[PDB]
Amino acid sequence: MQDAITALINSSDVQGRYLDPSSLDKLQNYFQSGDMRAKTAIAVSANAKNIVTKTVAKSLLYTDITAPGGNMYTCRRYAACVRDLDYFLRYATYAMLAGDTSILDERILNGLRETYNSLGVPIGATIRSVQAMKEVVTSLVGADAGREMGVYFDHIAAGLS
Amino acid sequence: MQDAITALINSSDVQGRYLDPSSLDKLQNYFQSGDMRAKTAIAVSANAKNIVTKTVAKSLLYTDITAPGGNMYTCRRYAACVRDLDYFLRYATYAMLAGDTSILDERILNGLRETYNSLGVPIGATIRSVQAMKEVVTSLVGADAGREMGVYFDHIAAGLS
Amino acid sequence: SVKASGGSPVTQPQRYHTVPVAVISHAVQQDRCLKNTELQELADFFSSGVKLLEIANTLTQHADEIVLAGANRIFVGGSPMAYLEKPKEKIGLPGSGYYVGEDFLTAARDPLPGGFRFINVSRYGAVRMKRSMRDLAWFLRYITYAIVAGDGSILSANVRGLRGVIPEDVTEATIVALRAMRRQSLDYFLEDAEATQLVKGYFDLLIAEYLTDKPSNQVRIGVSNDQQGLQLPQSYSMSAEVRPKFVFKQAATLTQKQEAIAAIYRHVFERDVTDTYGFTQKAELESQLIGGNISVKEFVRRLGKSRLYRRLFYEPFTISRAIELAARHFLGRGLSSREEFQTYFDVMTKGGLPALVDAFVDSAEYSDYFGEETVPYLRGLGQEAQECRNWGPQLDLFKYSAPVRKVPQFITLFGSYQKPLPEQHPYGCGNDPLEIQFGAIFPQETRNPHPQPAFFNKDTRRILIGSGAGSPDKLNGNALGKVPGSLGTRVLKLEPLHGHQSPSVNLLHHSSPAFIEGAYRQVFGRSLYEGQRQPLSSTESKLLGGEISVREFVRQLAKSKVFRSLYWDSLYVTKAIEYIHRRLMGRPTYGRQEMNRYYDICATRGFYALIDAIIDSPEYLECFGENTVPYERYVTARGYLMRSPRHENQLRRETVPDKYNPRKANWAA
Amino acid sequence: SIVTELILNADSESRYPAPKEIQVYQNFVKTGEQRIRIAKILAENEQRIVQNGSARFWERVPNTPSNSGNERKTASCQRDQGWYIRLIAYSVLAGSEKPLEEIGTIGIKEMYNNLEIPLRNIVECMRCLKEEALSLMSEEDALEVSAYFDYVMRSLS
Amino acid sequence: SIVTELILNADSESRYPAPKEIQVYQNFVKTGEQRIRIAKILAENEQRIVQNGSARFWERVPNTPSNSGNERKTASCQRDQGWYIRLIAYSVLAGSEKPLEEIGTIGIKEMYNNLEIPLRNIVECMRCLKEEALSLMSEEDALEVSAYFDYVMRSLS
Amino acid sequence: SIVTELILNADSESRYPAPKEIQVYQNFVKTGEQRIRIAKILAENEQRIVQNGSARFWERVPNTPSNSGNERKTASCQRDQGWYIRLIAYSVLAGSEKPLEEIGTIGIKEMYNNLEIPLRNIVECMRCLKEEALSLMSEEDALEVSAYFDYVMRSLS
Amino acid sequence: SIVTELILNADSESRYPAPKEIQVYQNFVKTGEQRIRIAKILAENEQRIVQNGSARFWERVPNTPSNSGNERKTASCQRDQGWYIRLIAYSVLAGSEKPLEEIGTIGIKEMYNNLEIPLRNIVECMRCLKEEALSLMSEEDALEVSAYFDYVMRSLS
Amino acid sequence: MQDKLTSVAKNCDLTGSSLNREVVETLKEFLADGEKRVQVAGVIGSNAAEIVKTAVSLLFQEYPELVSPGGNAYTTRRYNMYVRDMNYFLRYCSYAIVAGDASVLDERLLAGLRDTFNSLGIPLGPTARSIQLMKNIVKEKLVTAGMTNITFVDEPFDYVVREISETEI
């Protein structure tokens, strides 16, 4: 994976030149935002289980997904979906700390749609769950940090689609 | 699409042999059952609208599916669900007439799960509706013809699950 | 029931051993050029090749005499050589020019064992006599093959287990005949003492291996209740290529230990990458292995938990692909079932990559195959009995291009095994274009490969989501469909035209340039560039003057060189067929019926005939007639889902208490 | 089979089988026993049909690859005759020419042109086989067998 | 980057970042201005560093391909020196040797052996470049630059 | 008729009729006597069927334009009933619903909406007519007649 | 919505909204305050409209499923009446019939045929609802409401 | 993999009909034949080698070109592979007879079988013929043992053929 600093370094390196002033300004913006990024990571790490519980409550409960014949039927499938949401939240936190979505593409989104199609996991339902998770995180950590985290949640949702 | 005769002919043809006495006995069984199959097809055709009406009444009506926010809400989605139940009934009748489930494999179940997951159609509610339709058809055509039609209804339901 | 396919890799199993093949295979599996000793072996084999050829030719020229000497030793009361059937040349095969034109008429014009009983030819039967004579000739032929190959493997793999396949009643007789043949063969040199030595050795090897009585199959016991047990005949193992197995011994010299360590690196990292990536910590590990503190098992466990392994085979991959690769790196095999993948996925979720490495290395299977001192090696075809369930994925995993595929190959196939046919083109997921406004975007086979073939037969019909577009009169039969991004009643329609000049301002629904631009935007997906409309100007005129209908205008647009260059010249043929069908018919093809029909048209007549076949189809007349520009009428499930990325309206989540005094116990003091 | 054709005809109109389809289905189901008997006759008499038809065919058309002194070519021609009798038996069983069309008629010209076998000779051989097969059955039994033989002959031209 | 290393440790261990890792991340992002200033210092003085380092390196090691009288070889050596200074500036920016390692250290020995460039000569040239880089930098700023120069030299050695 | 359907199906593929189509044609022409007998029964009893169905239908639907005191409206409704019985007889003769569909089903909703005749009432009248007509047919004769009555009723609703 | 209408009309010709379309858009957005007032009027008087229209409709058509002594059927029919008033309020807000068409007109016949509710009765109930709703607005306010009620009635006939 | 009882019990919850009359009737019908299924499996296991040997010999009688040079059963290596695979088929068919369900065949016999056979060039026609020969031999042995209602014994073999054979019509 590459983070924001490494992304700028790679952008400058393919041209064989040092970081131009605009790249330095982007780097300084990332350095200035690191404090709120760490604060958001702390909050999400402290409330991960609550976040996933609220996400499932407002996105998947009492629908046909949890009924027999749904994809969250039986406790094993329910726990598997909860584990997938835990993965999504943790790697969204990783990407928010890193300042870019490379980790999401490398560890999650590469072939996740194919795996879900093979297993019969509904893509629309999990996109809805990711958007509900974005709303839950925004409610927990505030507006600005919520938007920063929603950038990567939207990246996950787009990658699934 | 293959019926009973075509399936037996295929099995004999890959071996390059005429139909052996076992396959000939199976063919004679199919010919003997053909009269009952035609009677059941006539009975289901005569009562298709009533069968689907009773299926919807006993499996979907007055639930949260037809309530606002449900997948059978709005007239277009209600009509589409009724159309899908018509599809299932008609193709189950086709499969019963043919004495073979290959028509359902090639025209009903292929990509049905992906399509339903893409549209948000509840899979479990569809399976329960197919079970209700099988019960209605069995009550209409009797125990023996009902069980014969239920073979293909169960094939559809198992493909959906 | 099982429609999913993992693909069919091209495999060429070894049927026997040759000296060059054996030497080169041993060198290949160690990833280095030939040694001096191996090159000397090859040179010695090559320098002696002329003598081997002379020996084989001598045996071939006297094949009838040798087989007769063998047969006369065991057969009485008849002529055995009457039952020896020679191979027949296939003359007059089609295309050989044997027949010119359609005229076919003018083309013509050692002591016997105690109590040995001979075999009566007449009572033995024609079938068994032919069997026996062909067996003797076959034995001699394979002996000459073994002489030429420099290796008796072609004999050993094909006669061990033969006893009993040839009836046990005549095994003794067989031996007698073979010995007789041997005697006759030795009568044909009598002057070399080296060719005689070679012939004696090969005959003795044949007799000794044929005498083995029902060799036991090598059993591959399932490692868990989710894995099946299998058997492999010894002949298959003997004929297969040999794995050079390295065993680490603390008493071995430093060079041999370093060779074993290099083998460990080549297995775990797929290549000795240790020097390239500056794996300096390796030194410490190597010491702990050389001094005997840890075993090869612990060395491999520490390698799997190293930063080098994480950088190479964890960081670039998802969890599923990383598990699939670690299976090969720590077990020498691919995953067997989806239950095995589920257990390893749970292990990785609970503890991470080190936990997964521990689960692989600490397994009973690892100690069963590699123990503590044996370097892990690649298993697979020819080493042990293989499963069909992970055939394609495992064969692709053992290739060097395995770390280049990012999409999981095992969990996807294992999941799709349990499902009906997928929602995809019958020719594969790579034949489905992106359902966008313009551009033929297809999954490239060789770039980020993720093909998932399925066994679609010729009668499968695809399920398509109707878009709900069309004029209101051409509706109410399929009006229940609704797709985002569909211009419903906004179809382009031009009523046909029927001695005075027209008024200055005559207004239709669309102006003539607007209608022509709409037709171009539908046929080509987008507006062409400035000069690109030059070849079609006359056609446009004929549309404006009523000479041709909108159907003919569309046909001429699709037949233009611009359309051919955009969607036919640089496209895989069936990909072009599918995309052109989507552009002209407004829907994807249903299945292999239409695809086969259009592919046959493209094969026999070409692109223009394909355009004519699509435009002249009855469905085109039913849907668009003569005056309507085509429009999108159906989309696939994935194309529908790509246009619906917002689900916030469905997440509305899911009053007066129903109990008085809740959460209280009865009769509280 | 005729049942598949009826079901596909109904499906083409997105409707349950009409009375005409049901009547065709019921007639076919009634005749199934006679169809099985005819198929058994064809199966048990295949070899003599092939031999007599080959004799007549070589008498009528001596300039064929099967009559060029090549044992393999003769064996292949007689195997093809047996295969086509088997396909006609399949079609008799199924009540339609669908098995024969799918296995031995679609692409027959391309296959036999690749093999460089004249098509007129195959038509004559089919005619001889039809003549020898029709003699082994009653007229009503031969009514459909002749139609299937004619179908092969028409597809070869 | 140090951020990438922390996230990768937490990622491979399947856990959210530990409190100490978050503290390390915060402390690192507090030094962005200093790192940017040091990187700008390296960038603005790359030419003089290369010139003085090449002069000293050819003084200490005259028997080198750069000093063999070939203009293209000399230009390539100067470009290599500039590239390694650029990589060290990248490493200063990222707070870790990771950019320099990934761009110019993995397979450095194999690449330079393919070019028939002695590795000890490159080590001496890197030492001279480090000397001049430290000569025009503050004491506290020199720690990262000297450490990364030593990292390059150790990778070559 | 069904013969026209077979001919058009053969013409669509630009080929002579296949054995399945010839079999369908022969099965159809085999039942001409039965079809003519059914048509004769329908023609002879047309007025009785109309009268009985009208009585039942006016019992079931008292407030209908036919039963509204207008003699001309009653006569027109009974003429419509007779015409539909005639069209069903045509369809029985032709072996398919094509005559009924082409003469009195395509545009039936538009015609009866223009006349302001509620379609539910016409469906009920057709139900009564079917019940009266099927009582005169034997068990083997009622399949096609009932199917064509159902065809009219489905076209109306 | 009329805004979507204008946007899609512009998109059909792949051109920006013309000044005429912008004028239509401005006129529509400057009349939205009156549309909100009409929608509020429909929402507040929905129960009155439903009860009075049900009284009139049962006066005209007493023998209907909603008036057969079944409490749940009456509740469902009156809920449907309220739902259609709601959809008409949506259409008034949006400036076009698209909300009504997409939510309660496409497939309305199929849905009500599956429920076995005769469509003539629903048309009569919609007519009574339209009269009751129009009796609560000025004619200028009632133009669009009449149009949308007519749209509903036409979809059922 | 699942047996008949497990699949029926899980479907009882899946379909929402619970333990209704049709499920009870099917369960009773299946349990009526359980002892016969166990007996059939015992007969197959006690005579496995003879069944496979007889079937492969009859296969080489009906396909004499298989054992000729250039055939797929040419040489003892490929002959042994023939015998091994026919034993595989017989073993899994006996499993399916015991279980009363074809899921074992789907999961452990037919998953990826076509891919393997295409990779190795194994002809499917002779494979189907050998499976049918083994089925006929098993039926003969069961008739010899005195079994009467053994229709279910046909179900696995035929099914496997239908799964591996190519589509001809």
Ligand SMILES: *[C@H](C)[C@H]1/C(=C/c2[nH]c(/C=C3N=C(/C=C4\NC(=O)C(CC)=C4C)C(C)=C\3CCC(=O)O)c(CCC(=O)O)c2C)NC(=O)[C@@H]1C
């Ligand atoms: C009752 C003894 C206890 C209790 C239960 C309780 N459950 C829920 C909600 C759910 N329960 C389930 C259960 C299942 N899912 C399955 O797949 C199976 C098959 C083995 C079962 C039994 C599920 C899925 C839900 C979620 C809602 C849904 O059905 O979609 C609740 C409500 C929780 C909420 O937050 O709404 C409750 C209260 N509560 C007690 O106090 C008892 C100990």
Ligand SMILES: *[C@H](C)[C@H]1/C(=C/c2[nH]c(/C=C3N=C(/C=C4\NC(=O)C(CC)=C4C)C(C)=C\3CCC(=O)O)c(CCC(=O)O)c2C)NC(=O)[C@@H]1C
């Ligand atoms: C929850 C929001 C939805 C859901 C999920 C669900 N997933 C599975 C199974 C798997 N999920 C994965 C996912 C991943 N693989 C990766 O590499 C990553 C990146 C870290 C992820 C997130 C995998 C590999 C599997 C298969 C392995 C397994 O089964 O554990 C299931 C279970 C399916 C089953 O049939 O058992 C479920 C339920 N399902 C929903 O309905 C939600 C919308």
Ligand SMILES: *[C@H](C)[C@H]1/C(=C/c2[nH]c(/C=C3N=C(/C=C4\NC(=O)C(CC)=C4C)C(C)=C\3CCC(=O)O)c(CCC(=O)O)c2C)NC(=O)[C@@H]1C
């Ligand atoms: C009242 C004017 C007429 C009438 C109505 C009636 N309706 C039902 C039952 C249902 N009605 C609906 C309606 C809708 N679903 C939608 O999505 C929309 C568009 C937004 C509408 C209008 C539905 C879904 C039902 C099913 C029941 C449910 O609540 O899920 C009934 C009851 C029928 C029954 O009990 O089977 C009735 C009586 N009946 C009349 O007589 C009037 C002419």
Ligand SMILES: *[C@H](C)[C@H]1/C(=C/c2[nH]c(/C=C3N=C(/C=C4\NC(=O)C(CC)=C4C)C(C)=C\3CCC(=O)O)c(CCC(=O)O)c2C)NC(=O)[C@@H]1C
């Ligand atoms: C009714 C029991 C359930 C229900 C169904 C529902 N389906 C749709 C839409 C579609 N249904 C299909 C299915 C098929 N089309 C085919 O051609 C075949 C094979 C013959 C099948 C099985 C398709 C393709 C669609 C997409 C739209 C279309 O008609 O083309 C809907 C509407 C979805 C939407 O909003 O677009 C609904 C509601 N929903 C339930 O809740 C019931 C349990």
Ligand SMILES: *[C@H](C)[C@H]1/C(=C/c2[nH]c(/C=C3N=C(/C=C4\NC(=O)C(CC)=C4C)C(C)=C\3CCC(=O)O)c(CCC(=O)O)c2C)NC(=O)[C@@H]1C
């Ligand atoms: C310009 C900002 C950047 C850029 C663009 C670029 N695009 C293409 C070619 C294509 N662009 C598309 C995109 C679309 N397809 C759609 O349906 C829509 C929505 C209406 C869009 C935006 C497609 C499909 C193509 C393929 C070719 C075609 O025109 O059909 C190119 C040409 C690339 C080529 O190799 O032909 C380019 C250059 N590239 C840059 O570098 C800019 C930053």
Ligand SMILES: CCC1=C(C)/C(=C/C2=NC(=C\c3[nH]c(/C=C4\NC(=O)[C@H](C)[C@H]4CC)c(C)c3CCC(=O)O)/C(CCC(=O)O)=C2C)NC1=O
């Ligand atoms: C339990 C499911 C299962 C099956 C079926 C299976 C088959 C199988 N048969 C094989 C070989 C083989 N199989 C055959 C032959 C045949 N095979 C037949 O089923 C026919 C009866 C016959 C041809 C008509 C031959 C000839 C080979 C060796 C191929 C070679 O020459 O390399 C191999 C490759 C060698 C091995 O690793 O065992 C496999 C995997 N493996 C499995 O796990």
